[PDB]
């Protein structure tokens, strides 16, 4: 199996964005793209991703606006802070770090984000534009965009191929399936309603497999078609060593013995999703002054 | 042999149910009633006929009807103004623009003017988004798409835990119905122009449900259908075979008589969708009126 090096590929894209952003700074005053990120409650998991997200933003020479709010916050306040970032012309990309507190309604908060700034592509209007044939959205969900880029960059054919997507999530599973189809892959989406032996039968002939269920060590190598490509989007924290570890959905050592390609975890689609968020933001800024 | 999914009858039953529901809401809410509004531009006899049929169905159920007929050579701006008038008309709950418009007008732009909550055909991206958004329900589902799922539910055809193949990925039927089946927990594969014939056949071999939406007359062979499967033929294409007035008959994607020997359930063309689509347009419009009042 060929290790799909997302860390390397993303490193290449990050530099391409830095040099692109540098050029635009010369052409348009002291202006640079802005990446905002609201966080409700001091959640340990989400705090880490935010630190990594603004690091790459700083590494590519973008502005970062990290809003943090406490746990016991009313919806009105959360929606005011989003509208603040909407009216801020120095902020071009807005994301709300899920998962929010149970008492807060995520849907109605995300709805407040302007369509031209919805950098994570979570607004229904952006989800629709994606799925609608003959219409292309302002943004694509980062993880799904990344998976396709790793597919193209590695020279992996999607036209006329059989594709199984494990998971139907709004962030990864659904959008990747829609995009794989847009590349003339014949896609089947597996999920909790699917029986295990159905899953395995779909996997039996799958040329491309996307593990986006988010359950560590679920996909075994025996299911993967010999000569297929497997993208492990799963990235759940396990507390085994030292003080945490990032294990994915695919049983790597099993799947590597059969698949022609395999994305590892860590160092797979994780750095891609960050790169795509920046590229989205960069494209967001380029739209504002195109 | 396979049993015949009588879509015509099912739709008839639904129109009766809507009629009663609309009559029940009248008593409770001051004699108020749902309004289905349409906009047609120019004078195409195809578009005029379609619009009559929808408005007649709306009359049978006791809904109000709003037909706006604009000239063929009218401005985009002026069309959109009339669309905005309907948006701000509380007597009107559903709004459809009859397609295709004249070439000089922009359709997607005229449709974008419609308020998301009055988009009876579910043509707006935001409604398409909500339809695909796992964990949210759209105010409207695409009519033909929704009526295919209701055909199944009403025949007692299980979707959850089943394998399904949607032949075709068209915006108007294929794509939406594929997501509705997944939402119903069927495991769905969408076959399309990029799909190999051998794979298409392989997928169909295990398909408990099959939705024929490619638009190719008589191409799904009966032997490809899994023994006991449910087949919904949504494709419709005229052919010059039959000695008849007009010299044609509508023929579906599926070879019916072949599919009947293997399938448990099937919907023939004619009998596939048709009055279901219009029925689903009325149900969509009821939900809008039900929503606009505050009733769940
Ligand atoms: Cl699921």
């Amino acid at each position: 199996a060929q290790i799909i090096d997302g860390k390397a590929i993303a490193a290449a894209i990050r530099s391409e964005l830095k040099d692109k952003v540098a050029a635009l700074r010369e052409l348009y005053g002291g202006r640079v793209p802005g990446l905002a990120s609201i966080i409700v409650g001091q959640r340990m998991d989400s705090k880490k991703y935010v630190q990594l997200k603004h690091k790459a933003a700083a590494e590519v020479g973008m502005a970062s606006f990290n809003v943090e709010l406490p746990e016991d916050i009313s919806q009105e306040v959360l929606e005011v802070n989003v509208e603040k970032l909407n009216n801020d012309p120095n902020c071009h990309g807005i994301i709300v770090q899920l998962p929010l507190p149970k008492h807060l309604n995520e849907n109605r908060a995300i709805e407040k984000i302007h369509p031209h700034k919805d950098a994570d592509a979570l607004l229904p209007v952006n989800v629709g534009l994606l799925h609608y044939k003959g219409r292309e959205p302002p943004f694509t969900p980062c993880t799904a965009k990344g998976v396709i880029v790793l597919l193209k960059r590695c020279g992996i054919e999607m036209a006329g191929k059989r594709a199984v997507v494990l998971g139907r999530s709004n962030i990864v599973g659904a959008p990747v399936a829609a995009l794989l189809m847009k590349e003339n892959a014949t896609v089947t989406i597996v999920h909790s309603g699917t029986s295990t032996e159905d899953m395995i039968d779909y996997l039996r002939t799958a040329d491309i497999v996307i593990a986006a269920m988010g359950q560590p060590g679920y996909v075994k190598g025996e299911w993967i078609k010999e000569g297929a490509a497997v993208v492990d989007v799963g990235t759940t924290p396990v507390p085994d060593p030292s003080g945490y570890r990032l294990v994915g959905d695919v049983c790597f050592e099993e799947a590597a013995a059969r698949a022609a390609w395999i994305s590892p975890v860590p160092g797979g689609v994780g750095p891609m999703t960050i790169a795509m968020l920046l590229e989205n933001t960069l494209e967001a800024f380029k739209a504002a002054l195109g």
Side-chain angles (χ1 to χ4, degrees), chain A:
Chain A
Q2 184 157 349
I3 295 197
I4 297 167
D5 201 344
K7 96 129 14 161
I9 291 175
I13 295 180
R14 260 135 54 188
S15 70
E16 219 214 324
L17 291 172
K18 182 181 194 136
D19 297 327
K20 189 170 172 180
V21 165
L24 281 39
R25 194 188 82 61
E26 270 319 306
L27 279 47
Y28 296 95
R31 302 175 183 176
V32 289
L35 210 201
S37 64
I38 303 188
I39 284 275
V40 189
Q42 306 312 117
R43 270 195 162 211
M44 297 155 115
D45 296 10
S46 51
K47 271 190 131 308
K48 194 110 242 184
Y49 292 43
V50 174
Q51 290 178 36
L52 297 174
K53 278 157 192 175
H54 81 243
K55 178 173 192 174
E59 188 195 316
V60 184
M62 292 181 180
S64 290
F65 307 84
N66 187 219
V67 175
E68 295 186 351
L69 310 178
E71 197 179 346
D72 57 351
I73 288 293
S74 61
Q75 271 284 143
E76 204 85 333
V77 175
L78 172 50
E79 292 172 8
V80 172
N81 285 241
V82 177
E83 188 74 72
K84 163 94 289 185
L85 298 170
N86 282 331
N87 294 16
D88 189 339
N90 212 155
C91 168
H92 301 91
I94 311 172
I95 70 182
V96 176
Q97 254 290 167
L98 277 49
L100 302 180
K102 294 170 187 185
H103 61 87
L104 282 168
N105 189 21
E106 295 181 359
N107 296 341
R108 194 157 54 77
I110 290 186
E111 219 96 62
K112 262 277 211 186
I113 300 167
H114 275 208
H116 59 96
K117 294 191 181 190
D118 180 33
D120 257 320
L122 296 165
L123 283 185
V125 73
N126 292 316
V127 175
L129 286 164
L130 194 198
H131 284 106
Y132 218 82
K133 202 101 170 294
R135 291 272 257 153
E136 275 74 64
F139 303 106
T140 301
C142 303
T143 314
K145 204 179 201 135
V147 166
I148 278 50
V149 182
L150 297 182
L151 270 38
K152 263 105 89 68
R153 261 301 170 191
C154 288
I156 304 181
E157 285 182 354
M158 290 160 283
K161 299 298 170 190
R162 303 183 77 160
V164 174
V165 173
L166 307 176
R168 57 173 164 182
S169 66
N170 299 334
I171 191 169
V172 191
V176 169
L179 290 174
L180 268 25
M181 180 160 55
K182 194 76 92 292
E183 224 79 27
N184 284 2
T186 296
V187 187
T188 304
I189 298 167
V190 173
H191 48 79
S192 73
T194 320
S195 72
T196 297
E197 67 189 344
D198 281 3
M199 185 201 313
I200 293 168
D201 189 50
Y202 286 122
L203 292 167
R204 213 93 296 211
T205 60
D207 285 300
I208 306 187
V209 184
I210 306 296
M213 274 171 60
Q215 297 177 234
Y218 187 76
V219 183
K220 292 178 191 182
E222 70 202 41
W223 307 337
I224 301 181
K225 184 189 178 173
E226 200 157 330
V230 184
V231 187
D232 190 353
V233 174
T235 301
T236 67
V238 178
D240 188 30
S242 60
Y244 85 120
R245 169 177 152 86
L246 220 65
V247 182
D249 290 4
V250 181
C251 297
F252 190 80
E253 293 178 10
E254 300 171 16
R258 309 221 307 162
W261 301 79
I262 187 162
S263 167
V265 174
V269 312
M272 290 302 297
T273 308
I274 295 182
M276 297 300 134
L277 178 49
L278 299 174
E279 189 167 59
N280 277 26
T281 309
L282 186 274
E283 212 64 47
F285 179 59
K286 287 213 344 162
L289 324 179

